[PDB]
């Protein structure tokens, strides 16, 4: 059984993507649900689990079957507990792009998430670990990270810091190896 | 962040 992964804080998307691309044997993505209709080249159970009834998915959301659920363009989307479990049971760490609220939900489902928060040391440090954004965007990312830590600190398996994304990525990989015992 | 996947966009309106 492989513990699912939730990385949070600035650069988490880049970390998620890189783990998936670098170690395809170790990490995988689970299959999400949506109520939107299936399109060409899409396969039920691979791209999405396609739900025929919006009423069904709402009931399931209310029954706590989803660790993360939302809507876009008139349709429902979500990441089910069972989909994560299916990845974990195949021996792969499920890389989850989800909010910190999904951590307590995975714990309550006894899936043992490894929740890693990437903490910016300062506004200055955000522009060190993310080279794609402006100072005022970094300010907004910094305020978000501050609020996330204030709220979710108890949920974190570990907090990582660094002066570059490369260093942070290195620490992230090390945390996952250590917590995979 | 242009042409963000729809699943990732759905995170912006969460329940």
Swiss-Prot record, chain A:
Post-translational note: Palmitoylated. Palmitoylation is required for targeting to postsynaptic density, plasma membrane and synapses. Palmitoylation by ZDHHC2 occurs when the synaptic activity decreases and induces DLG4 synaptic clustering. Palmitoylation by ZDHHC15 regulates trafficking to the postsynaptic density and function in synaptogenesis. Palmitoylation may play a role in glutamate receptor GRIA1 synapse clustering. Depalmitoylated by ABHD17A and ABHD17B and to a lesser extent by ABHD17C, ABHD12, ABHD13, LYPLA1 and LYPLA2.
Location in the cell: Cell membrane; Postsynaptic density; Synapse; Cytoplasm
UniProt superkingdom: Eukaryota
Residues with the Phosphoserine modification: 74, 122
Tissue expression notes: Expressed in brain (at protein level). Detected in juxtaparanodal zones in the central nervous system and at nerve terminal plexuses of basket cells in the cerebellum. Expressed in cerebrum. Expressed in hippocampal neurons (at protein level). Isoform 1 and isoform 2: highly expressed in cerebellum, cortex, hippocampus, and corpus striatum.
Residues carrying Phosphotyrosine: 48
Start and end residues of each Guanylate kinase-like domain: 2-177
Domain notes: The PDZ domain 3 mediates interaction with ADR1B. The L27 domain near the N-terminus of isoform 2 is required for HGS/HRS-dependent targeting to postsynaptic density.
Subunit-level organization: Interacts through its PDZ domains with ANO2 and NETO1. Interacts with KCNJ4. Interacts through its first two PDZ domains with GRIN2A, GRIN2B, GRIN2C and GRIN2D. Interacts with ERBB4. Interacts with KCNA1, KCNA2, KCNA3 and KCNA4. Interacts with LRRC4 and LRRC4B. Interacts with SYNGAP1. Interacts with ASIC3. Interacts with SEMA4C. Interacts with CXADR. Interacts with KCND2. Interacts (via first PDZ domain) with CRIPT. Interacts through its first PDZ domain with GRIK2 and KCNA4. Interacts through its second PDZ domain with the PDZ domain of NOS1 or the C-terminus of CAPON.
Function: Postsynaptic scaffolding protein that plays a critical role in synaptogenesis and synaptic plasticity by providing a platform for the postsynaptic clustering of crucial synaptic proteins. Interacts with the cytoplasmic tail of NMDA receptor subunits and shaker-type potassium channels. Required for synaptic plasticity associated with NMDA receptor signaling. Overexpression or depletion of DLG4 changes the ratio of excitatory to inhibitory synapses in hippocampal neurons. May reduce the amplitude of ASIC3 acid-evoked currents by retaining the channel intracellularly.
Protein family: Belongs to the MAGUK family.
Name recorded for this polypeptide: Disks large homolog 4
Lineage: Eukaryota, Metazoa, Chordata, Craniata, Vertebrata
Residues of the full protein shown: 533 to 713 of 724
Curated annotation (Swiss-Prot), chain B:
Subcellular location, record wording: Cytoplasm
PTM characteristics: Phosphorylated at Ser-14 by PRKCI. Phosphorylation is enhanced during cell polarization induced by calcium. Phosphorylation may occur during the cell-cell contact-induced cell polarization and may contribute to the segregation of LLGL2 from the PRKCI/aPKC and PARD6B/Par-6 complex.
Domain of life: Eukaryota
Effect after changing residue 14 to A: Loss of phosphorylation
Signal peptide range in chain numbering: none
Phosphoserine modifications at: 14
Family of this protein: Belongs to the WD repeat L(2)GL family.
Subunit: Interacts with GPSM2/LGN, PRKCI/aPKC and PARD6B/Par-6. The complex is enhanced during mitosis. Interacts with DCAF1.
Entry function: Part of a complex with GPSM2/LGN, PRKCI/aPKC and PARD6B/Par-6, which may ensure the correct organization and orientation of bipolar spindles for normal cell division. This complex plays roles in the initial phase of the establishment of epithelial cell polarity.
Note: Overexpression of LLGL2 inhibits the tight junction formation.
Protein name: LLGL scribble cell polarity complex component 2
Organism: Homo sapiens (Human)
Segment of the intact protein contained: 640 to 654 of 1020
């Amino acid at each position: 059984y492989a513990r699912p992964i939730i990385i949070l804080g600035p650069t988490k998307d880049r970390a998620n993507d890189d783990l998936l691309s670098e170690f395809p044997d170790k990490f995988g993505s689970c299959v999400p649900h949506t109520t939107r209709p299936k399109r060409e080249y899409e396969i039920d159970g691979r791209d999405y689990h396609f739900v025929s009834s919006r009423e069904k998915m709402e009931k399931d959301i209310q029954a706590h079957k989803f660790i993360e659920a939302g809507q876009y363009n008139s349709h429902l989307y979500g990441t089910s507990v069972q989909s994560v479990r299916e990845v974990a049971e195949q021996g792969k760490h499920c890389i989850l792009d989800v909010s910190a609220n999904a951590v307590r939900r995975l714990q309550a489902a006894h899936l043992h998430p490894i929740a890693i928060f990437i903490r910016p040391r300062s506004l200055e440090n955000v522009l060190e670990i993310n080279k794609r954004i402006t100072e005022e965007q970094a300010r907004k990312a910094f305020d978000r990270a501050t609020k996330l830590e204030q709220e979710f600190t108890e949920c974190f398996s570990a907090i990582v810091e660094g002066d570059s994304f490369e260093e942070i990525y290195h620490k992230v990989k090390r945390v996952i190896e250590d917590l995979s015992g | 962040l242009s042409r963000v996947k729809s699943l990732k966009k759905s995170l912006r309106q969460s329940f």
